[PDB]
Amino acid sequence: TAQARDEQYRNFLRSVSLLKNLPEDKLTKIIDCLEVEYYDKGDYIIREGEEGSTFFILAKGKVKVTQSTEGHDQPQLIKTLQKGEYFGEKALISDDVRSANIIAEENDVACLVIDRETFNQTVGTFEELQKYLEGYVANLNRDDEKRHAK
Ligand SMILES: Nc1nc2c(nc(Sc3ccc(Cl)cc3)n2[C@@H]2O[C@@H]3COP(=O)(O)O[C@H]3[C@H]2O)c(=O)[nH]1
Ligand SMILES: [Sr+2]
């Protein structure tokens, strides 16, 4: 049922650090506008260098994050993300192309997809979250420069 569906998504979204304290009305907007994408082991969810305007929330499975760096021929494995975590916000906050690869590490991986407008009208609407995200993005820029990202 419609309401049972919204409830299952609402319960899951409340468990995401970034959305935990969001007001009910904005959480409802996320629930009405989100889309679901499934991936199999090895699939690229995001490719470094491509244009991107969507924010992702890992709803099932695990993915790996890889990045091209100076001195290396193959992208370096930066970290792994699991259910409840998110990615893709950097492109929206810096207004730039994707800065790393996100690859499905398991079969039947599932991500919740949120467009730029929705992201701006919800998360970007509260100064608390905006400030948190900017600070986090600033740290990522510093990690990139440290490992000599390409
Ligand atoms: N440049 C860079 N990106 C990183 C790094 N670690 C991650 S996982 C992650 C996700 C969310 C938070 Cl708050 C913190 C870490 N990412 C994600 O990869 C995405 C590629 O696409 P994008 O749109 O550039 O967003 C990027 C980020 O979300 C990193 O050390 N350097
Ligand atoms: Sr850049």
Structure tokens at 121: 């009208």
Find out whether the beta carbon of 48 lies less than 6 Å from any atom of ligand 1. no
Q: Which residues contact 44 (CB under 8 A, 6 or more apart)?
A: 101, 102, 103, 104
Instruction: For residue 139, report the distance from its CA to the centre of ligand 1, in Å.
Output: 10
Taking the C-alpha atoms of residue 19 and residue 59, their distance in angstroms, rounded to an integer, is 14
- Tell me which residue has its CA closest to atom 9 in ligand 1: 87
- Resolution (angstroms) equals 2.0
Which two structure tokens, joined as six digits, stand for 136?
């986090």
Q: Residue 124 and residue 103: Cα distance in Å, rounded?
A: 26
Task: Report how far ligand 2's centroid is from the alpha carbon of 92 (Å).
Answer: 12
Task: Using only the alpha carbons of the chain, give its radius of gyration.
Answer: 16
Please report the atom of ligand 1 found closest to the CA of residue 94.
24
Contact 56, 38 (CB under 8 A): no
94 in Cβ contact with 137 (< 8 Å)? yes
Q: Is the dihedral of CA 128, 123, 83, 41 positive or negative?
A: negative
Phi then psi for 136, rounded to 5 degrees?
-65, -40
**What's the full length of the chain, in residues?**
150
Q: How far apart are the first and last CA of the chain?
A: 48
- For 50, counting Cβ atoms within 10 Å of its Cβ (0-12 exposed, 13-18 middle, 19+ buried), the class is exposed
**In angstroms, what is the span from residue 14 Cα to ligand 2's centroid?**
32
Q: Which CATH superfamily is domain 1-150 in?
A: Jelly Rolls (2.60.120.10)
26 is in an annotated binding site: no
Ligand 1, atom 11, residue with closest C-alpha = 87
Domain borders along the chain are 1-150
Q: Give me ligand 2 centre to Cα 98, in Å.
A: 8
Contact (Cβ atoms closer than 8 angstroms) between residue 101 and residue 46? yes
Exposed, middle or buried by CB within 10 Å (0-12, 13-18, 19+), for 43? middle
What CA–CA distances, in Å, run from 132 to 9, 75, 137?
A: 24, 28, 9
